[PDB]
Structures are given as structure tokens and as C-alpha cells.
RNA sequence: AGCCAGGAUGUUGGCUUAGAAGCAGCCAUCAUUUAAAGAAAGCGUAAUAGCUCACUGGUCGAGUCGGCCUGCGCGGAAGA
RNA sequence: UCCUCCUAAAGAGUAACGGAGGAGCACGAAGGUUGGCUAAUCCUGGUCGGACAUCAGGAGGUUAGUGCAAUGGCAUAAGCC
RNA sequence: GCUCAACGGAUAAAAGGUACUCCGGGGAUAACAGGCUGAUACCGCCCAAGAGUUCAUAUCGACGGCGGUGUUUGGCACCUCGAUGUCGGCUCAUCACAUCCUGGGGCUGAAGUAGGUCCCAAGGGUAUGGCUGUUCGCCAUUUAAAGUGGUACGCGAGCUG
RNA sequence: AUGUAAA
RNA sequence: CCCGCAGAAGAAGCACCGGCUAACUCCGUGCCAGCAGCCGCGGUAAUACGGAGGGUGCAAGCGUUAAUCGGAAUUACUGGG
RNA sequence: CGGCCGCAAGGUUAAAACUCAAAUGAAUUGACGGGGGCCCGCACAAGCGGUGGAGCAUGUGGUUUAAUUCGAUGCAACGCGAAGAACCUUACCUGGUCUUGACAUCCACGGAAGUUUUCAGAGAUGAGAAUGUGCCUUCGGGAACCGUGAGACAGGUGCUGC
RNA sequence: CCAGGGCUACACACGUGCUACAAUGGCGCAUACAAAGAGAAGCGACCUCGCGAGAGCAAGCGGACCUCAUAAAGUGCGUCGUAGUCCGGAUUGGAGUCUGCAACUCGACUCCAUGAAGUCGGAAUCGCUAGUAAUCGUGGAUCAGAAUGCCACGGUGAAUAC
RNA sequence: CGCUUACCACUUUGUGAUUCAUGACUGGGGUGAAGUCGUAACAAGGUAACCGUAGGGGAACCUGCGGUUGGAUCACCUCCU
RNA sequence: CGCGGGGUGGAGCAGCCUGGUAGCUCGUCGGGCUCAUAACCCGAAGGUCGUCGGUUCAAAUCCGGCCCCCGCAACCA
């Protein structure tokens, strides 16, 4: 698919046990960087908020190329961790969780034409005071944009043109703000659906370090490695999910 | 210029095998029978089929078809 | 306030809140005379040395320079020692 | 001895407000309007990629261009400063069609109704309330329609303020 | 100063 | 209500099994599915979830839910500080 | 919230909804005190010679690769397991092979075991040629060795020191 | 199971040791003093050759006799005059020797030639109270060959503890 | 019988009390194996704590005044009864 | 384009006025101190002063030209 061949945004965020989960989020950045350098992908750190004892709390990173999103679709969700940590003086198995969002490109086709043939321009007389000027005048412009319903009212100066330029700048600013607000709501409504609450619930993937097991909740794989997984080579987990996803 | 005629057999052609087949787009834009036919300019079909023009015959039988230079005009040219 | 090109219609002159820019200095020498010389920019070769330091050769011709922003002029040099 | 730089230099020596103002004047010079033009605005046309299951031309139409009107903002000050009262509202209207409806027709991407676009046609009609002083606009409900403009953005020797 | 969670 | 016909012929389920409180193992997941009146289990050796076997309890009823009293002397007059 | 008092701040009386199976008081034993008293250790004081500045040797973390085998990873890991990685060791990887097997036992059949030598292949192996043919005779068999076939199994330096 | 590669890779950091940065020191000659050990598919006298690592021949010893095995710092004498220098020895090239089937990744040793950083070390940190620190040499386990590591022995040998 | 008066239901008007839902916004309360900042209380908790009151500060809180030990130390001063 | 402020480690400022020297702070990396983090200490990198030309014995500086960032870019009757 055309969308597939697209690049991606990876957003790795810490959940339960934010001290430990930052350490696992840094290692997941290491996981997907070792998976990305194996197939020659470009990794750029756009934003990374550090933790306390190492790692990172939130990582937003662009990966560009030819086919990142179509090859990393099934990574949005949770990751449980059973591990014996280093920030402990007791030596007990603790569980943490990390949440990973995978966003597509969605390339910015911004600034549509203002369409003055579709703009309704009403140049009528002004309210306010101080001059006859006002009386013989007009000097007040209201411009309505029909397919959105945005009205711009300007009664600033004595002349229409110097108010025409202000009215068109306010039209451009309000249309750009209303489009970018819808785009940021469309980002957030998908990020709230992909990223859950961040709790220790089962969300499609596990990481069982003392057992030596990787057991996902979809396509029940039982790979007993944790050494060909921690250094790239994530083909055996991602490929059969794609195999039984193409059947639907 | 009008008028009864013709305006073919493989071309379901190889093409991305779901089909583009004279006429979406590719390129090739063959060759025979030949009074004549472009492997096609348009209409119409999922594609066909079909309908015209290209061109060639015949009745017909005198002038006709398309460009350049200008003069005077036509329309665009609708107010309180 | 003053200087330089156009505007400005081939003598002089000529206006606009016209189009481009500068000056309110400097010089005991950069002035006078005499004597002598011709650059800029490229090419080749050469120790540091490299596009550009200096040297030798060749092209080139006053596009260089004339203290200063511009015009005219300059080898008989007004340029350089 | 003067950046007396307002630089042919009124004093050696000087900033502001007047809507409390006042006088001699000016259309030599502005505001409101009338006048000339039409950069702008509105409308019409030429070319044509393209949108439209095909298909520029049912309806649109980029990139470009040519015209009409004097309805908006504009430009110049030709008339007015020994006086032309301007906005909005009430009453009273008049005219042009670049027609909102009614009427007669053509195309349609018009099965009928309901439609889109275009031509002729000004004979008649062309809202009611809230807000805002507001023209205008939004809302609520009708209507067949809630037309655009000119007439000193009509009308104060007709009326408020 | 601080060192969150699974006897 | 009594007599006769025929043939074991037509007639057994429900809850619980860690403690309170009567009764034990195996398999399947794996702080997930889930149970639970309280303490609470399940984080790959579960007498606590699901299934099987076995047992326990009650019986044409068995569990859950709702209400009253007792235990609760945790409304104390009997019978508290 | 309501009533009353007060100039105010506010005071007095005084609930309900909802959550939890704890909250509390006394006292015992350990832990700790930047609490006190006492005592000890190169613990502090005094000095000696070092490390950290340089090169080499080794190990680890990290990076890369086919693996850079695995464990140890605060004192109590880091010239540690390893009292010694060219092959061997090797548990890792690439390539080629074997599967009741390289190693332990049972059944049936066949063959002294062994030695020398040659061909192809990286070699394991595959294909051969000679020689030797005993220790007890139920002599259809033995006590070892070797090859074939089937099942029991063997094997694992694979995981769990929770 | 076999052949090869890897465990020795390298932009970086740390731990532990050796050699140093020199004149109580380097070089050359002469010379004195040890203990503890190991040895047979081993130690390997003596003689000869090679500048050399070692090679050829070949006694003794499974051992208080035989071998490894000349102990070094220490002493005398000569030189070097405080310079990155006659200190230090990394790295590199050539020719080599031992072992092993094979020394290229990836062993040890010797010669020639080159001969860097380093001129006493930042924050900070370690061990020691005696034959101890510090310095110097030797042997063994591992092992066909392969340590500065480990174990063990000996020579000189302080200072401080109020 | 009819009329008229007195009692009088349904209903209407005016003004209050009480109660139930709803109401933009705002305050405090309770829960949440992870979020940000500070370490205020438990040792003399590193400024002893607690209570009442007034003020201040992002916040545990701080400051002043009054009360209480539901607080440690009292072989470091010197000299002692 | 016209006017103004400028271009100094990765970043913010001194230092330009008034010439003789590249400086400070935050930040990055690495090592210590702690069982670990924070704090603290030490060391290293980093800019030639946006660029070019001229005066000067000497331009981070004085002046001019070019490039880049930000702000003001026609209004009050």
C-alpha cells in the first residue's frame, strides 16, 4: 500500500515505575536503533526527556526511509517487564510497563487558497466616532469564508485597503489555526487510542527476563532466546503477525 | 455538391492474461485482393457488434474548393 | 549649504517629497623642478607555499591607478620611485 | 572667535495646549457633496490545460488578456469657507435593468416534481420582531419574492436628535 | 537531600 | 381407603473442598483469564481460577440475593467506661 | 447547612453522602540516632612507597561483526572461573555430513580383532586391495572386538542458584 | 562429527600489574654471598659451531652425589655532567632460533636498524607498624610451545606510633 | 315551587416557609503497584514537637506571643556545698 | 529594498565606545566523592570574534562593502 511505504514517528513513553521504566524506554530506543541500523534506517532524536537514574521518560523520534510505518504498524501498545533491577537493595523481581506509539507521516498540505471568489466581502459604514468621515464613508469590512463559516470584522482605520490587508491576514491566521487545531485533535484522538493508561495490564507484548521467554498476547510465540532479540533481529516477532494480518 | 453501392479474412494480435479488439494510454502505424480502403478522424459499446467520413466507382455534367492584401459594414455595445 | 551623472529637448541655463551617491576633511608631503619606469587580471615553474606573499618567463593592454562618492581626462603621463 | 547646519546668517538670549477661544481673510487649501479619470470595485467577453464514469465548453475554470458602468475605496482640487445641514430612522416616492417573484422560451450531466445555466420582458408586487443610533449583519417565522443602484449614498424652508 | 513497586 | 394385572419396570439432583467450616490430587493458563462473606490467592510446580477424577454436606430440593434477631456486654436497666 | 452571639477575625450547637479493615494505648526483642559512657582494628594522626599524568600486559563495561561462547558484575566482579584461546580446549559462528546415534545396556544376523596401502574430498567420511583367521567346543553356539535393523533410550556446557 | 574463523576484534572508559621519567643512575670489565624447588614419551653436564636465540655429538640422575644453575642488587675501577641527553624502551622493517601437523589472524626468544610518549603526575585514592614497607633475583604449578599473572623461597632493608 | 340570607366544596389572585431534582462556574473531601517539587513530622529528624491566636509564603510550612512535656543531653567548661 | 539594533564557544554575556590579552557563566563529555542519584570538585573540547577590503607597528575593536536574524516599514482630521 502507498501509506505503508511511509516513514514513521516512534513515541516511547514510561509507565509504571517511572525510575525503572525510563531505563527500559532507553533500552527500547536501543532496541529499535539496533533493529533500524540492521536494515539501514535513519534515526534522528527529535525530543528526549531524561529520567533520574538514566534512560529517558519520553522519546519522540523520526525514522525516515522507504517503508517504516508498514513494517512497524504493530508496535503501538504496552510492554510489560519482569526483571531484577539495579535500583534495588533487596533483589526481587519487579514489573514495569512502557507504552509505544507508532505514527505515520501525514505530510503537511497546508495553506489552501483564500479564494476571493468564495469570500463574501461586505463593505458597509462603521460604528464609533469623531468624524464626518465616518458619515460619508464605509471604512468597515466584514469578510465571510463560505465553506468554513469564518467571519472577520475590521473597523480599525479610515481606509478600506489598509483594513483589507488586516482582514486577509486575520482570515489566513484563523483558517490556519482552525486547520492546525483539527490536525492536532486528529493526532490526539489517535494517540489516546494507541497509547493506553500506562498500567501493568496485558497489551499485546511481554518481556520475561528471568524466565527467558518472549510471549506476545497476539500470535502466541514462545521464543526462548532473549539474546538474539536484545541485539536487533526482531523479524520472528513481527513477521507472523503480518502473515495472519494479510489474511484479513 | 447531392443519389441507390463498396468501405475486407485471420486483428478474441502480442500488452500489466479480469478486458480494452480500428477508435483511454502504450509502440509497431504490416502486407494482399485490388473499381478503392486509414490496420482508422468521429459517434456508440465492460470490449464487441453497429453507424458515418476518409477515398474509389457509376447517373450527372458545367466551373468549383481553400489561403493573402485591403475599402465599407455586422456583433460584442447594458443606467439610472 | 555645497559637489558629481541623468532628468534636460546635441551652445549656456532649466523645475518636482525625481532616479543614484558624497562632503563640513586631509597634505610639510601625496607640492615645484630634474631624472627614470609602465600596471590590473590569468598561465607555467619554484623551500616552507595553500585560490591569492615574493621571483623568472609568456599572454594581455590601460578593464589598473589618479587620497575620498561620481563625471570628464591622463603616457608628452595628471600614475609610480 | 559662529555644526549663526533654518547654512545670503531676523535676538548675544525663547518650548507647548486651546473642544473657553477671538479677529482679518481663503475654495490660493482640506472635510460632506457635485466635476474629470477609472489604479480599485461590480459585471460582460477571448483563449484554453483541467474538474466532471468518457467528454474544455450541462455547470465551473487556473495561467493569461480585452472591454462596459460610475453603484465602494481611491487620485486631482474645477465650484462652494461675505455659509450648499451631513448619518441612521418615520412619511412620501421617481427612474434604469446588470430580473427576486410572476410571464414567454433554449440547453441540460432535464424519467415527473423540485432543480443548474442563459435570453427577452420593469406591467405589478418586493417582509414581521430582538440586538445595535447604526445603514449592514445574525437569529426566529412567513412569503411567490424579502432585487441591485442612481436621484446632494433622494427627501430637516416635511419631523425628531 | 534522595533512593517509587512483587515475601 | 381396599383388592387385582404387568414389569426394577416411570422417578436425583444442587452447593462446597486454604483457614473460619465438613472434604484431596492431576492437567491448562500465568497478577492474565478469574474467584471471593473476612483473612485474601493467581508474577510458569495453584490443596483458593477453568476442566477431569475423588470426596464432603443437604435432599425434591440445593446455592445466591434481600430483611429481622442472636452472637453484639460493639447502645451495657439486667450488662460498659 | 441551620439557629444564636460578635464591629470583624470568628466562637457555640452540630450532621449526612462516600472510602477502609484498620486506626489506637501500654510493653518486649532487634535496627538506627548528625544521643551519652566505655573498648577494639593501619580506622584516624605521623611518615614510607604507590594508583590516577606515559607506554606495555590482562580483564571488564561499551561499539561493531558470523560469533566477538557462558558465568562473576558495591565492599564480597574486574592478571575473577581460566594453574596458561594457533588446531585441539570450544560450550560460539559459517559450510559439509550422521541419526537408535560419539558415549551406557538388551535382541537377531554377519565377520578374529588388528596391520599395511591406494582413490575422491577441507576433512569427517565414501569406495576399495592384500594380510591375519586364537584363548572352549552344547560345536543351530561361546568370553571380548566390529558392522547392520527396530524399540526402550542415550545425550544437552539448553532454562531455573527465586 | 569434520575444515576454517572467533574467543586476541576497537571512535571510548575503568580496574589490577610491569617498565620508566634517571646521577643513592645507565654502560663495560673483574668479583663475593643464598634458600626453596622440579626432573624420565624429562633435566640435559663436557666438547664443537653460530655475534646471538639455539643446533650436532653425548655422561650422570626417577635423585643431599647428576642437571636446571652464572643468582641479582652489593664492591672496586673507567666513562657519562643535567641534556629528552649515552635515561627510558613503545612501535615498525629485514634476517633469524625453539616447539608443534601447521606461529598468517594468533606463541615465546635473539640480532641489526629505527627508537615515540614520558622530565615525578589534576580531583581523589591505596597498603604498611616490622625483617615490615620498598627494592632485587630464582624456582614451581599450568604446559608439545606460550607470563609482567598466581603460588613459593632468598639478598639488602628503614621511618613513624605524641 | 320560586326568591333571599347564613355555612360551604372545585377554582382564581397576592405574598411567604419547607423540601426534592437541575444549574454555567467555583471550593474542599475520598481513591488510584508511575507523574512534578520540597523534606515538614518519627533520633536532639539535623531550627525539639504539639495546641490557641495574628501575619506571610508554590507547598509540606515559617515567624511572633501564651501554655505543656505527650523531649534527648546532662565527665567537656572551673569550683563546690 | 528603505530605517534601527546586532552577528563573540553548543547557548547567553563581557570585552566595540577609548586598539596592544580572547575572558566569564550556563551547558556537553570523562573521572572522583556516595551502595546509587542529586549536590560539590577536577580535567578536556568548543569560538578568532558573521565575512571581505582599507588606515595603523597591531583590528574582536575605527570605517566602508556583502550575507544572515529580529523589530519598525506610511499615518493622526
mmCIF file of C-alpha atoms (C1' of nucleotides) in Angstrom, chain F residues 7-54:
data_model
loop_
_atom_site.group_PDB
_atom_site.id
_atom_site.type_symbol
_atom_site.label_atom_id
_atom_site.label_comp_id
_atom_site.label_asym_id
_atom_site.label_seq_id
_atom_site.Cartn_x
_atom_site.Cartn_y
_atom_site.Cartn_z
ATOM 1 C "C1'" G F 7 -42.822 -55.310 34.723
ATOM 2 C "C1'" A F 8 -36.829 -52.542 38.888
ATOM 3 C "C1'" A F 9 -40.108 -51.537 35.424
ATOM 4 C "C1'" G F 10 -41.597 -44.148 35.157
ATOM 5 C "C1'" A F 11 -38.937 -41.128 39.071
ATOM 6 C "C1'" A F 12 -31.798 -37.387 41.903
ATOM 7 C "C1'" G F 13 -30.297 -33.616 41.713
ATOM 8 C "C1'" C F 14 -27.687 -28.726 43.871
ATOM 9 C "C1'" A F 15 -23.562 -26.347 46.608
ATOM 10 C "C1'" C F 16 -18.577 -26.813 48.579
ATOM 11 C "C1'" C F 17 -13.352 -28.913 49.075
ATOM 12 C "C1'" G F 18 -6.577 -22.959 52.092
ATOM 13 C "C1'" G F 19 -8.433 -21.258 57.393
ATOM 14 C "C1'" C F 20 -13.159 -19.819 59.675
ATOM 15 C "C1'" U F 21 -16.283 -24.777 58.304
ATOM 16 C "C1'" A F 22 -17.202 -30.961 56.593
ATOM 17 C "C1'" A F 23 -13.526 -32.697 52.390
ATOM 18 C "C1'" C F 24 -7.622 -34.258 48.184
ATOM 19 C "C1'" U F 25 -4.835 -34.765 43.842
ATOM 20 C "C1'" C F 26 -3.765 -34.060 38.333
ATOM 21 C "C1'" C F 27 -3.892 -31.007 33.752
ATOM 22 C "C1'" G F 28 -4.439 -25.846 31.206
ATOM 23 C "C1'" U F 29 -3.156 -20.994 31.552
ATOM 24 C "C1'" G F 30 0.167 -17.236 34.181
ATOM 25 C "C1'" C F 31 -1.267 -10.632 38.825
ATOM 26 C "C1'" C F 32 -3.936 -12.715 32.606
ATOM 27 C "C1'" A F 33 -8.370 -15.340 32.341
ATOM 28 C "C1'" G F 34 -10.656 -15.173 37.021
ATOM 29 C "C1'" C F 35 -12.839 -16.383 42.485
ATOM 30 C "C1'" A F 36 -14.191 -14.182 46.982
ATOM 31 C "C1'" G F 37 -18.867 -13.434 53.208
ATOM 32 C "C1'" C F 38 -13.495 -11.841 56.047
ATOM 33 C "C1'" C F 39 -8.208 -13.086 56.039
ATOM 34 C "C1'" G F 40 -7.148 -12.703 50.708
ATOM 35 C "C1'" C F 41 -4.858 -16.283 46.032
ATOM 36 C "C1'" G F 42 -3.361 -16.287 40.796
ATOM 37 C "C1'" G F 43 4.003 -12.894 38.865
ATOM 38 C "C1'" U F 44 5.183 -20.914 34.577
ATOM 39 C "C1'" A F 45 5.227 -26.956 40.299
ATOM 40 C "C1'" A F 46 -2.352 -23.067 42.088
ATOM 41 C "C1'" U F 47 -4.995 -28.231 48.143
ATOM 42 C "C1'" A F 48 -8.043 -20.618 46.609
ATOM 43 C "C1'" C F 49 -9.369 -19.600 38.506
ATOM 44 C "C1'" G F 50 -11.183 -23.157 34.479
ATOM 45 C "C1'" G F 51 -11.626 -28.650 33.246
ATOM 46 C "C1'" A F 52 -11.192 -34.005 34.995
ATOM 47 C "C1'" G F 53 -11.197 -37.672 38.929
ATOM 48 C "C1'" G F 54 -12.431 -38.362 44.014
#
